[PDB]
Design a protein around this ligand. Structure first.
Ligand SMILES: O=C(O)c1ccc(/N=C/c2c(-c3c(Cl)cccc3C(F)(F)F)noc2-c2cc[nH]c2)cc1
Ligand SMILES: CC(C)CCC[C@](C)(O)[C@H]1CC[C@H]2[C@@H]3CC=C4C[C@@H](O)CC[C@]4(C)[C@H]3CC[C@@]21C
Length: 241
């Protein structure tokens, strides 16, 4: 019918094509949990091996988010400066939101390298407080039981934010943002899910968590540079040095 029903469909399709891990796989695998022996195996790995592994997974996760963004109506018609401003500010925020699908609140585990494990899996990295904060964020989000379409629409909005500093064509970003806001709000009304609005994270929370996360990734990358399977030169250039 309207532009807006079509926009819901195209955002959800973009998400489906880029969600990386299927929800029904993630749910089915919840009973597949790392054994005590497997956990010890991970805890004994070098900090630097765990860093290599996690950095590679995080890179790949960011690439799926970039592909998601590229498929959002109007995103590719933004100027390249603005595309990069949006991705730099938002792509890791989206990854952190996407985690909640892979997180099981019943036992505080995340799907990692084919089974579920708790935060203690990552002991060798020596960032227990940061990791705990990330797990807690996913735990808060878990309680919403976000649907796949809610995740799609919400994460589109994490990216398409006209308030990011440094945008050159702010009105163009505003147009996209308003349409996405309408799509999300329409969809929540249609599905009797508007109750989630008051339960979503305060925006400051996601921003500060992400900033802390990226800061730690930068520290590790300075200490122990990784090989990146780089697909997006303008974005790579902004994050790596
Ligand atoms: O394919 C490409 O070209 C490409 C380009 C950039 C990429 N990600 C960059 C990262 C990383 C990060 C990661 Cl994921 C791992 C190790 C070290 C880092 C470091 F912090 F060092 F950058 N952290 O946040 C972002 C990010 C991206 C957008 N907003 C935030 C990923 C793939
Ligand atoms: C600060 C870093 C050095 C260590 C970060 C440790 C985390 C929080 O312990 C990371 C390590 C690997 C990360 C995961 C890598 C890949 C994915 C798939 C993506 O679709 C959702 C997020 C998800 C599931 C990540 C969530 C957070 C993880 C699970």
């Amino acid at each position: 019918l309207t532009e807006i029903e079509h926009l819901v469909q195209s955002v959800c399709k973009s998400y489906r094509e880029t969600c990386q891990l299927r929800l029904e796989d993630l749910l089915r695998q919840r009973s597949n949990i790392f054994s005590r022996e497997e956990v010890t195996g991970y805890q004994r790995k070098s900090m630097w091996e765990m860093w290599e592994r996690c950095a590679h997974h995080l890179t790949e996760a960011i690439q799926y988010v970039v592909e998601f963004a590229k498929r959002l109506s109007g995103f590719m018609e933004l100027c390249q400066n603005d595309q990069i401003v949006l991705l730099k500010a938002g792509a890791m925020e989206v990854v952190l939101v996407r985690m909640c699908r892979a997180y099981n609140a019943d036992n505080r585990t995340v799907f990692f390298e084919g089974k579920y494990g708790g935060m203690e899996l990552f002991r060798a990295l020596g960032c227990s407080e940061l990791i705990s904060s990330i797990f807690d964020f996913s735990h808060s989000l878990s309680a919403l039981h976000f649907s796949e379409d809610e995740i799609a629409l919400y994460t589109a909005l994490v990216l398409i934010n006209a308030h990011r500093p440094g945008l050159q064509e702010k009105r163009k970003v505003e147009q996209l943002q308003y349409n996405l806001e309408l799509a999300f709000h329409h969809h929540l009304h249609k599905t009797h899910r508007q109750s989630i609005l008051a339960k979503l994270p305060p925006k400051g929370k996601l921003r500060s968590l992400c900033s802390q996360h990226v800061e730690r990734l930068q520290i590790f990358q300075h200490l122990h540079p990784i090989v990146v399977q780089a697909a997006f030169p303008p974005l790579y250039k902004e994050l790596f040095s």
